[PDB]
Design an enzyme around this catalytic site. Structure first.
Site, PDB file in Angstrom:
ATOM      1  N   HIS A  41       0.863  -1.170   0.000  1.00  0.00           N
ATOM      2  CA  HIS A  41       0.000   0.000   0.000  1.00  0.00           C
ATOM      3  C   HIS A  41       0.906   1.229   0.000  1.00  0.00           C
ATOM      4  CE1 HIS A  41      -2.754   3.043   1.750  1.00  0.00           C
ATOM      5  NE2 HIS A  41      -3.721   2.296   1.251  1.00  0.00           N
ATOM      6  N   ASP A 100       3.237  -3.589   7.809  1.00  0.00           N
ATOM      7  CA  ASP A 100       1.956  -2.901   7.652  1.00  0.00           C
ATOM      8  C   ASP A 100       0.808  -3.883   7.872  1.00  0.00           C
ATOM      9  OD1 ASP A 100      -0.420  -1.807   6.787  1.00  0.00           O
ATOM     10  OD2 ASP A 100       0.244  -1.432   4.726  1.00  0.00           O
ATOM     11  N   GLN A 113      -4.672  -4.509   7.080  1.00  0.00           N
ATOM     12  CA  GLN A 113      -5.631  -5.551   6.722  1.00  0.00           C
ATOM     13  C   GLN A 113      -5.455  -6.742   7.652  1.00  0.00           C
ATOM     14  OE1 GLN A 113      -8.132  -5.344   4.736  1.00  0.00           O
ATOM     15  NE2 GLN A 113      -7.614  -3.320   3.911  1.00  0.00           N
ATOM     16  N   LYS A 132     -10.890   0.365  10.194  1.00  0.00           N
ATOM     17  CA  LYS A 132     -11.023  -0.907   9.485  1.00  0.00           C
ATOM     18  C   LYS A 132     -11.261  -2.061  10.459  1.00  0.00           C
ATOM     19  CE  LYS A 132      -8.203   0.416   5.457  1.00  0.00           C
ATOM     20  NZ  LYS A 132      -6.933   0.152   4.716  1.00  0.00           N
ATOM     21  N   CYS A 172      -4.681   2.561  -3.654  1.00  0.00           N
ATOM     22  CA  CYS A 172      -3.407   2.999  -3.149  1.00  0.00           C
ATOM     23  C   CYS A 172      -2.365   1.937  -3.322  1.00  0.00           C
ATOM     24  CB  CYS A 172      -3.512   3.302  -1.689  1.00  0.00           C
ATOM     25  SG  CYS A 172      -4.731   4.544  -1.358  1.00  0.00           S
TER      26      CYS A 172
HETATM   27  C1  LIG Z   1      -6.084   1.171   4.852  1.00  0.00           C
HETATM   28  C2  LIG Z   1      -4.658   0.701   4.698  1.00  0.00           C
HETATM   29  C3  LIG Z   1      -3.602   1.545   5.059  1.00  0.00           C
HETATM   30  C4  LIG Z   1      -3.820   2.940   5.591  1.00  0.00           C
HETATM   31  O1  LIG Z   1      -4.816   3.239   6.609  1.00  0.00           O
HETATM   32  P1  LIG Z   1      -5.119   4.752   7.105  1.00  0.00           P
HETATM   33  O2  LIG Z   1      -5.987   4.526   8.281  1.00  0.00           O
HETATM   34  O3  LIG Z   1      -5.768   5.401   5.942  1.00  0.00           O
HETATM   35  O4  LIG Z   1      -3.801   5.338   7.447  1.00  0.00           O
HETATM   36  C5  LIG Z   1      -2.290   1.100   4.916  1.00  0.00           C
HETATM   37  N1  LIG Z   1      -2.016  -0.161   4.433  1.00  0.00           N
HETATM   38  C6  LIG Z   1      -3.047  -1.002   4.078  1.00  0.00           C
HETATM   39  C7  LIG Z   1      -2.728  -2.371   3.553  1.00  0.00           C
HETATM   40  C8  LIG Z   1      -4.373  -0.581   4.209  1.00  0.00           C
HETATM   41  O5  LIG Z   1      -5.279  -1.355   3.890  1.00  0.00           O
END
Ligand SMILES: *Cc1c(COP(=O)(O)O)cnc(C)c1O
Ligand SMILES: *Cc1c(COP(=O)(O)O)cnc(C)c1O
Lengths: 400, 400
Positions: free
Chosen positions: B119, B196, B199, B222, B358
């Protein structure tokens, strides 16, 4: 004129039943039904592109969200809504200016003038950037009237001065220094001014055009709004000249392993998913506030404070740090621990605070380790004053 | 042992009826009643020291807030809750690691290995800090099955490798790389790993101890939680080694015009007023979630995406980009515009989205300009799949 009714304003705040006598609005504001309801709906409604049974409600939420920037602009008399940037608070706004505008322009020996009456939010970031660039922070002291000695600026400014950081209104004394004059000096010296408006935006929202303000920051939770939401105003050219803040989604245009290109202001400075609940709640707070005449609202607040001060001023040992008949009332009594009194007052149904208010340098100047602070809002009443005065008497009876 | 009951799970979401067939949870999740109420109460009550009628409510809100870090710690199996830092999202978390840990350490010619499946939030910040330090970003390509190629890692790692940036789970393919092996590889070479988990935290919350993760980041919204709140987990040694993030109140201990001292972590990295609603919200979301077996919940969701994929695979032109039977279903139809399909689906009451998510480098690699995406959460049903499939049929009939 739409005459300001204190009672009708007060009746919009659900916390007041249980809040007792709430005199700690300078730390954080209570919320009107508008803010609570809008937030309620946002979290009860899908953010998706489908609405099977609540389309109308959703369309109204989207409306608040899309008009949010415009409402901040209107509040600050900003020329257009693209000069408004969302942050998480006043603190982030200032750090953004120090890192994104200042850092890439400061050279070793450069000078940053910070006022001695500043909140840490508008001091620490400059201490940081200076140690990162080799620049340094020069102190702007108080004058005889307890305000940043703006008239002294001509002496404090050298060929190396780049930045002035000054608060519109102190969160301790409530005093407002000669900001317009400060900006005149700063600009004739090629400097940029960072204005802390966390307090000023609630009581005398700055007219950023007439004042010719470069940067302006405030927090939503003090403006009757949600936590976790803030504002950074900047002139077009400045936001354009600023470098990107946080890197991520939204703020970029195109990306690859060779590099990236960005959106322009303000999106250039807003990476990742926005605090939607924050923006919508703030938009709702502002939309609601716009029904009321702030000068009349502020005059009611200040009047209450003046009644309280006069009453307290009769008790022996009373010392005040209040400037300009401010809605904020910092004070204390000789021979009594601020800690003990806040405690007893709480027991008596009075809610305020003491401590240092994130203004260690300012207090050091005033010669005290801290102060009690009672701040008044348009939702406070006359009987709130009497209750506080009586609570203080009750406490002095046990403590002295 | 307990059996996951989807009907029970979805009954907690006040938005369900209006939302129709909600298939955009990978972008942002619906909220359970507990998150809504907790927020509602928080904004309807004073945060002051006085409570005349609603004292129970106030205590419980203080309890949610004081227990927030520990619930995030329990989610990840962190050793201590002092290892959990509040941010405004995954994006801020990663920018923090890049700016506060990497930036002060990187030398010129140093290497940062970044997965092509990242992302933008876990790519841009590294492109930035690379340009700022003279380090360089090294690409980790995908393997035959569309996963970051971990077996190729020992070949890409050199004496100058310092940082490995890797998503636990892609927001496009729903695929998870072999994380435990990538980390072993990186550590043998003295590298630190930024994972990261925006998800991953939702579907397979990482055991930060078992996987020996150095840094881990995810977003509240999320995870059925509030907007404007995120988490950054870091081993305590790493957090202590980081420079402070933003300067301001809360994060400082002593301030003067000569410089300052900071709190210890996590408070060192948290300047200004925290998003108190966000924290209380995320707290309530995590407390609600801990009554469900998330392992089973994820299998239910995956099972639906499999039903959906099998059926759509019978419609000519259908191409899937789904990995490992993920609950995330990214796909497209040959010769049909995504935007048009998204629109027609919405009129059939199906909520999803198209676009680039993204993740430009990933899409470029996969050879597509964008993809539709249907993500299933435990509050979806078999009925939802049926509605999706039929809505696609009519869409195809209207667009072909
Ligand atoms: C949504 C997401 C992000 C970023 O989340 P924010 O709350 O917008 O900072 C980063 N990496 C992944 C894989 C995502 O799904
Ligand atoms: C409250 C306040 C701040 C800090 O705001 P945050 O929302 O905590 O960033 C800064 N300056 C002044 C004058 C304040 O009153």
């Amino acid at each position: 004129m739409n005459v300001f009714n204190p009672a009708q304003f007060r009746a919009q705040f659900p916390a007041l039943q249980d809040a007792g006598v709430y005199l700690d609005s300078a730390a954080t504001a209570l919320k009107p039904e508008a803010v609570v309801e809008a937030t309620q709906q946002f979290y009860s409604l899908s953010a998706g592109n489908v609405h099977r049974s609540q389309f109308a409600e959703a369309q109204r939420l989207t409306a608040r969200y899309e008009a949010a920037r415009e409402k901040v602009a209107q509040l600050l008399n900003a020329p257009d809504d693209k000069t408004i940037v969302w942050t998480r608070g006043t603190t982030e706004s200032i750090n953004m200016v120090a890192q994104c505008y200042a850092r890439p322009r400061l050279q070793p020996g450069d000078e940053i003038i910070v006022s001695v009456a500043e909140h840490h939010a508008n001091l620490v970031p400059w201490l940081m950037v200076a140690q990162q660039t080799g620049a340094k922070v020069v102190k702007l002291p108080l004058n005889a009237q307890r305000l940043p000695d703006v008239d002294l600026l001509p002496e404090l400014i050298t060929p190396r001065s780049r930045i002035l950081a000054l608060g519109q209104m102190s969160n301790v004394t409530g005093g407002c220094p000669d900001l317009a004059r400060a900006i005149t000096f700063a600009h004739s010296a090629g400097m940029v001014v960072m204005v802390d408006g966390a307090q000023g935006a609630v009581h005398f929202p700055a007219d950023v055009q007439q004042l010719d303000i470069d940067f302006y920051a405030f927090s939503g939770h003090k403006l009757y709004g949600p936590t976790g939401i803030g504002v950074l105003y900047g002139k077009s050219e400045l936001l354009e000249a600023m470098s990107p803040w946080l890197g991520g989604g939204k703020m970029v245009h195109e990306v690859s392993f060779d590099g990236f290109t960005t959106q322009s202001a303000p999106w250039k400075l807003e990476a990742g998913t926005p605090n939607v609940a924050g923006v919508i709640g703030l938009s709702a707070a502002l939309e609601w506030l716009a029904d009321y005449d702030i000068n009349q609202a502020e005059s009611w607040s200040r009047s209450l404070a003046t009644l309280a001060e006069d009453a307290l001023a009769k008790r022996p040992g009373f010392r005040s740090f209040r400037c300009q008949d401010s809605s904020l009332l910092a004070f204390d009594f000789a021979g009594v621990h601020h800690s003990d009194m806040v405690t007893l007052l709480a027991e008596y149904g009075i809610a305020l605070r003491a401590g240092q208010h994130c203004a260690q340098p300012l207090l050091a100047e005033l010669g005290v380790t801290g102060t009690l602070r009672a701040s008044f809002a348009p939702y406070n009443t006359k009987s709130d004053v009497d209750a506080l005065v009586n609570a203080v008497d009750r406490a002095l009876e046990l403590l002295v």
